[PDB]
Design a protein around this ligand. Structure first.
Ligand SMILES: [Mg+2]
Ligand SMILES: [Mg+2]
Ligand SMILES: [Mg+2]
Ligand SMILES: [Mg+2]
Ligand SMILES: [Mg+2]
Ligand SMILES: [Mg+2]
Ligand SMILES: [Mg+2]
Ligand SMILES: [Mg+2]
Ligand SMILES: [Mg+2]
Ligand SMILES: [Mg+2]
Ligand SMILES: [Mg+2]
Ligand SMILES: [Mg+2]
Ligand SMILES: [Mg+2]
Ligand SMILES: [Mg+2]
Ligand SMILES: [Mg+2]
Ligand SMILES: [Mg+2]
Ligand SMILES: [Mg+2]
Ligand SMILES: [Mg+2]
Ligand SMILES: [Mg+2]
Ligand SMILES: [Mg+2]
Ligand SMILES: [Mg+2]
Ligand SMILES: [Mg+2]
Ligand SMILES: [Mg+2]
Ligand SMILES: [Mg+2]
Ligand SMILES: [Mg+2]
Ligand SMILES: [Mg+2]
Ligand SMILES: [Mg+2]
Ligand SMILES: [Mg+2]
Ligand SMILES: [Mg+2]
Ligand SMILES: [Mg+2]
Ligand SMILES: [Mg+2]
Ligand SMILES: [Mg+2]
Ligand SMILES: [Mg+2]
Ligand SMILES: [Mg+2]
Ligand SMILES: [Mg+2]
Ligand SMILES: [Mg+2]
Ligand SMILES: [Mg+2]
Ligand SMILES: [Mg+2]
Ligand SMILES: [Mg+2]
Ligand SMILES: [Mg+2]
Ligand SMILES: [Mg+2]
Ligand SMILES: [Mg+2]
Ligand SMILES: [Mg+2]
Ligand SMILES: [Mg+2]
Ligand SMILES: [Mg+2]
Ligand SMILES: [Mg+2]
Ligand SMILES: [Mg+2]
Ligand SMILES: [Mg+2]
Ligand SMILES: [Mg+2]
Ligand SMILES: [Mg+2]
Ligand SMILES: [Mg+2]
Ligand SMILES: [Mg+2]
Ligand SMILES: [Mg+2]
Lengths: 46, 93, 271
RNA sequence: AGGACCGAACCGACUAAUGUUGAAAAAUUAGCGGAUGACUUGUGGCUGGGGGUGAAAGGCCAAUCAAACCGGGAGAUAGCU
RNA sequence: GCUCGCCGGAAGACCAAGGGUUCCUGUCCAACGUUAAUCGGGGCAGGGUGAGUCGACCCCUAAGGCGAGGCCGAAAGGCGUAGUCGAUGGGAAACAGGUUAAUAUUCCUGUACUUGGUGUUACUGCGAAGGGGGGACGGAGAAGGCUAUGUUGGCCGGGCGACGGUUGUCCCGGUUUAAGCGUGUAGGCUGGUUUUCCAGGCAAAUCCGGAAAAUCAAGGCUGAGGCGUGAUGACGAGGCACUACGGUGCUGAAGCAACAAAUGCCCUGCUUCCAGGAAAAGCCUCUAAGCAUCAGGUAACAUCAAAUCGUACCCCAAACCGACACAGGUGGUCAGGUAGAGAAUACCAAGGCGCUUGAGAGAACUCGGGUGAAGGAACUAGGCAAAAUGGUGCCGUAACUUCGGGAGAAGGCACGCUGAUAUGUAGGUGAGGUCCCUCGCGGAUGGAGCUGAAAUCAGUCGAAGAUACCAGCUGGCUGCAACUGUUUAUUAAAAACACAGCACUGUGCAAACACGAAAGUGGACGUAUACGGUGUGACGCCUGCCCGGUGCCGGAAGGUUAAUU
């Protein structure tokens, strides 16, 4: 069976990376929430 | 021309190993640990000036650090650069 | 000509093809080509705004001269060409100064024919004049609606417009739909009708032939569930409803034109 | 020539047996259909939740779909257990 | 270590994605490993990834994204111009041999190539954000010419056989060599050259386009392979000397020919069809502004530079996606022998493995298989399952038919081996010799050698010759749907959906319609032989009556009737 996670680094970064989160207001709010929570890894880039 | 202090900082340590010794004895090549950001021209000039030898060519690679464990705590060693420096068949540093 | 295919397989039995032996076999004229990629019927929001579009064969756009405003210089037809973008054929013409252009091919036009544009052009098929200088009763195609804008009416294969009357600054036309319309007498038109009149006699023969032209299947509204279409639902085949579009508007007879700006030019609806 | 024919790769899933705390949260074995096409496949892209997409089964939209998931209103309300 | 077994269009070998040290060495066996473990992809320590030419980066763009101003929107924001990003595509350049425990087109040896910067010299009209050319493009089919590669012979080295025979028509092994440079072949395309002129290519143009003359007919472009050189080199069976038994050193024969032959190359060709088959840059060329014995351009020579990042290892898998060392999934390349149409199948080669619990026993019963007296569907909801059929050539083949089909209808006969025709035939390939010429990778003749079906006749063995693997069951009547397709991922594949065809209906272009507070966008760079909606569903013969009800279309005299006043 083909499973749902089919990894690809380029797609991962283009979809959830830091510069994708920074491009929109809601993405920046995601980053603000994650900084307030105290997350060690902010996005999938790291 | 590269300034003297840059040259004084690029080279870090000679590298000792079986492959390094074999390279020295069979190919007139020494193996050095250099600064992570040193370029081939910088390394060439530094070996020319500090060891007053004549270099033929420099080959360079980056070594990735290993992931270890120190009592159930994971750590990583730093990446470093090593250079294979080929001398001009008459120097024998 | 119109050619029936031998029934050597169930997909060939009903195929009728329209083959023109005098169309150019080689490649099109490169300087007048241009890319156009497909849309799938999706607009700039990326949503399907026109259903049943998608796929088909890749095509290149031919830049057709609908203005025909290179007046006073005669041209000669070099060849007739196939055009995937339209039902009519196009002709590559060569002006006496060395410029080449594509025009819609009128009926009867062959390679070596002479065409010309302008107020002094002869009354021959393929020539373009303002409808002021065209005799009443003539059949024309590629009709302009605003002077200088380029031909917009009667461009499909086999269609034409008849000039019915002239009254001062306006002429009255009889369009293929049967509607009588007024346009300004300074709009241009080309004499004769568009060639390839056999285009309607073709029979595609199989589903795949429709797919090759970028047409995707049509699902009947009555075959759906009520959530998808106003016609959906039923245990078995049931209708009991007045037929409507997928968005709830009556679809058998209800009129949808509402344009008061242009109502003044419609002498008589098609009926 | 052909949405032609027989048949591997490839794409499917008609029958039977097994399996059913499985080798596997949909498979295996033996047969089975298409196999130049309305085919199939890699990479990248677009369409976002009363919305999409649908050769239409209320199908599919990350093992979730007659209205996804996550957080909030929120200790919703529960003449019921 | 010897034997046995399994895979071999993979269970071998590479690349991409993805992973990230799992790679190699030393050491340890608690935990991990479905058992033990001295072993490990486990723990601990050390080592290991070398590039001007490979990839990324870089130049150029596709879909698409973002988007100065701009247009639009309560705000947030939406769209979009100039631009700027974005490969899955276009763009310069390296091969062979050797070497490490672990890297190698990167190191070493040998032989090459590309781009750019400086400098000298010799000539010289250079110049773009512009023009033109080029790049530059489909499906199918058919050959012809080749190569990879294989087979046989010759040649070279070795052998003379555990048991009858084996100095020969005998056995075993080897017989390899690249990029580059020179030649420009099979073959493909295209007439060439010189003047004069011109409403075209936003301006100009000597370039492209067009027109008119003159002259010559061979000129140009592309091009696999071969041959020569690279190479007196390297490699090379084996032998000799060490071995600290893993390996190290030294030396080194032959290194040819014929035939067969790709799905690879010529070929981005050729032929044909309709469904009519990217873009931009690199590159060539033309000039404008401008510059002007300057700059710049062309050529030769000399010299310098080519940075940075990746490079280990797995990669149909114990390392990726499935919670697992999980019978699942995963794109691309390579492609030997015998038989075979074949990438099917059987047995093998190169290479790789025996799937991380065993040992016994030989009950019922379960699973996967083999055979079965007589009967032969009596079973059962139902011939479910099983059994059976199965190849090639030839003979022969019904109703019905839309004239194609039905049809491989049905059914039948031949089939191994040996000899002869013919010491190997028809055919294919083709050396030497001979003769010509525009002289060469040339043309004609010529047939040595090699390879080689199919058939007929005779004989011969078995129960059986398509002997294994592989490989249609057939016929008759009828419902439904014309057909090929599609569908409920995971209990439904169908008579359901689609379909070509038919009809009604809307729509005159700023189209109807759809997405959207809007700007806009699709429809469509389309224009009624077009586009949307609805129903029906190939084809044949057809499609009757009802406008009372409900819709829709038209009308606008009268009645009733909103805001307003
Ligand atoms: Mg080097
Ligand atoms: Mg490097
Ligand atoms: Mg439609
Ligand atoms: Mg239809
Ligand atoms: Mg239904
Ligand atoms: Mg409804
Ligand atoms: Mg009913
Ligand atoms: Mg009823
Ligand atoms: Mg077929
Ligand atoms: Mg099923
Ligand atoms: Mg199966
Ligand atoms: Mg079939
Ligand atoms: Mg088949
Ligand atoms: Mg239902
Ligand atoms: Mg799901
Ligand atoms: Mg709801
Ligand atoms: Mg509340
Ligand atoms: Mg509660
Ligand atoms: Mg075997
Ligand atoms: Mg580790
Ligand atoms: Mg290991
Ligand atoms: Mg123990
Ligand atoms: Mg254990
Ligand atoms: Mg380990
Ligand atoms: Mg763009
Ligand atoms: Mg935008
Ligand atoms: Mg702005
Ligand atoms: Mg760019
Ligand atoms: Mg790429
Ligand atoms: Mg290795
Ligand atoms: Mg050969
Ligand atoms: Mg490697
Ligand atoms: Mg295991
Ligand atoms: Mg597995
Ligand atoms: Mg697959
Ligand atoms: Mg096989
Ligand atoms: Mg037993
Ligand atoms: Mg049994
Ligand atoms: Mg049996
Ligand atoms: Mg029996
Ligand atoms: Mg019996
Ligand atoms: Mg019987
Ligand atoms: Mg019975
Ligand atoms: Mg009974
Ligand atoms: Mg059965
Ligand atoms: Mg059977
Ligand atoms: Mg019945
Ligand atoms: Mg059917
Ligand atoms: Mg079918
Ligand atoms: Mg199902
Ligand atoms: Mg519009
Ligand atoms: Mg129906
Ligand atoms: Mg009726």
């Amino acid at each position: 069976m083909k499973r749902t996670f089919q990894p690809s680094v380029l797609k991962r970064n283009r979809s959830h990376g830091f510069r994708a989160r920074m491009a929109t207001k809601n993405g920046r709010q995601v980053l603000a929430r994650r900084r307030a929570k105290g997350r060690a890894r902010l996005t999938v880039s790291k | 021309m590269i300034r003297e202090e840059r040259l004084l900082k690029v080279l870090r340590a000679p590298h000792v190993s079986e492959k390094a010794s074999t390279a020295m004895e069979k190919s007139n090549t020494i193996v050095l640990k250099v600064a992570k950001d040193a370029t081939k021209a910088e390394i060439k000039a530094a070996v020319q000036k500090l060891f007053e030898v004549e270099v033929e060519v420099v080959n360079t690679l980056v070594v990735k650090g290993k992931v270890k464990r120190h009592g159930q705590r994971i750590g990583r060693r730093s990446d470093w650069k090593k250079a294979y420096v080929t001398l001009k068949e008459g120097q024998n540093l | 000509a119109v050619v029936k295919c031998k029934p050597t397989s169930p997909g060939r039995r009903h195929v009728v093809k329209v083959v023109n032996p005098e169309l150019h076999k080689g490649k099109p004229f490169a300087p007048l080509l241009e890319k156009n990629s497909k849309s799938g019927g999706r607009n700039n929001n990326g949503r399907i705004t026109t259903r049943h579009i998608g796929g088909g064969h890749k095509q290149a756009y031919r830049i057709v001269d609908f203005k025909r405003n290179k007046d006073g210089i005669p041209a000669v037809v070099e060849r007739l060409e196939y055009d995937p973008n339209r039902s009519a054929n196009i002709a590559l013409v060569l002006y006496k100064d060395g410029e080449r252009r594509y025009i819609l091919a009128p009926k009867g036009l062959k390679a070596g024919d002479q065409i010309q544009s302008g107020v002094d052009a002869a009354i021959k098929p393929g020539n373009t004049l303002p409808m002021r200088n065209i005799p009443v009763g003539s059949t024309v195609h590629n009709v302009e609606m605003k002077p200088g804008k380029g031909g917009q009416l009667a461009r499909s294969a086999g269609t034409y417009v008849q000039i019915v009357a002239r009254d001062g600054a306006y002429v009255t036309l009889r369009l293929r739909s049967g509607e009588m319309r007024k346009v300004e007498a300074d709009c241009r038109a080309t004499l004769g009708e568009v060639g390839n009149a056999e285009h309607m006699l073709r029979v595609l023969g199989k589903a795949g032939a429709a797919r090759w032209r970028g047409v995707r299947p049509t699902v009947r509204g009555t075959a759906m569930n009520p959530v998808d279409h106003p016609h959906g639902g039923g245990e078995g085949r049931n209708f009991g409803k007045h037929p409507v579009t997928p968005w709830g508007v009556q679809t058998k007879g209800k009129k949808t034109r509402s344009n008061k700006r242009t109502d003044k030019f419609i002498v008589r609806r098609r009926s």
